[PDB]
Amino acid sequence: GSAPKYIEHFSKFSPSPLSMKQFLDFGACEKTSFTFLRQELPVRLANIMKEINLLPDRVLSTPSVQLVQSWYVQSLLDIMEFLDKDPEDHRTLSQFTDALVTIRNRHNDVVPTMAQGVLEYKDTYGDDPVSNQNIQYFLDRFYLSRISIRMLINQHTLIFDPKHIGSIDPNCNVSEVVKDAYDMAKLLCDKYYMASPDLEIQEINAANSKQPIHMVYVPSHLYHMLFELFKNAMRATVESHESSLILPPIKVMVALGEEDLSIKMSDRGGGVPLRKIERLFSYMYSTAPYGLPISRLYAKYFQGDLQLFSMEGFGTDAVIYLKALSTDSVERLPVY
């Protein structure tokens, strides 16, 4: 086989970050999407695969890692087939879309698969701070890499099968996504607890006092994050007030500035002490025999962040920081 040679070849290129703008303007440009995707997916696959291989033989040789490594090898090769094919042959295009689908389905379970490797490492070698910083370093990178691959793939398969441009909404109403995510979390909250905090939403459009706040974003990434946040805020609120009557609302604010769009979600669930806040974001210290960390990645992915600060004995605030302008929303990608 050729795999390690290909990996070596394509790992000399640097993956290429795109912006929301460049992502929009892509969506008949199917020849052009293809000729781009056939270089770039291998680049991105090569690069992360190269980094998997820098892991110590004690990690590298465990079943989890070796399995997901087998998926990446097949996906690379799967796309190799197409390096010398013909962009003008409308059935070459037709069967590449099929090929991307099969790849997206080969990888659906990397999250819980890798989670197994964390779990085995944890009982196999220990949960020390140094192990943990490396797991953290590796997984933020790997999962961020993966997020971008799916972004590429979803943009192609959705556009090449009028308002939304595949997974991007160029007029995303942020309150709307807030309410939806809330409704859904509230549904689960009512099932498992038979009580649930209300929602208040206020907007602050700096430049434009009374216009509803819209942006260019990938709404499902935003739903993902809001949803996680609402689950956490509901849990704490409900459970901190079991012996008590009153049940405080979850208060969200959506602020729109010159460069940030920010979303705060304040609760009164009684908080977390400063010392325990880092762990909530740790893959290792929160795996036990998508999550905060992964929500944060989604924010980081287009130059955003997702930050927690608590007041122990009162509650927790959670901010999602996003770039307001499409021009500032550019993929954050790791490189070998």
Ligand SMILES: Cc1cc2ccccc2nc1-c1ccc2c(c1)CC[C@H](C)N2C(=O)c1ccc(O)cc1O
């Ligand atoms: C993040 C998380 C995942 C869980 C998964 C399974 C079971 C319980 C869980 N609980 C949490 C969870 C949620 C809120 C909080 C904590 C843990 C630690 C204790 C504390 C009361 N707490 C918070 O203050 C808190 C944390 C994140 C957040 O977005 C909102 C919050 O109100």
Ligand SMILES: CC(C)c1ccc(COc2ccc(CC(=O)NCCN)cc2Cl)cc1
């Ligand atoms: C499941 C996957 C995500 C996983 C599980 C576990 C790990 C852990 O990897 C470690 C653990 C400890 C050290 C310190 C050290 O002293 N190293 C010696 C040099 N080799 C380095 C690394 Cl890369 C990574 C990835």
Ligand SMILES: [Cl-]
């Ligand atoms: Cl993911």
Ligand SMILES: [Cl-]
């Ligand atoms: Cl729940």
Ligand SMILES: [Cl-]
């Ligand atoms: Cl933080």
Ligand SMILES: [Cl-]
């Ligand atoms: Cl290095």
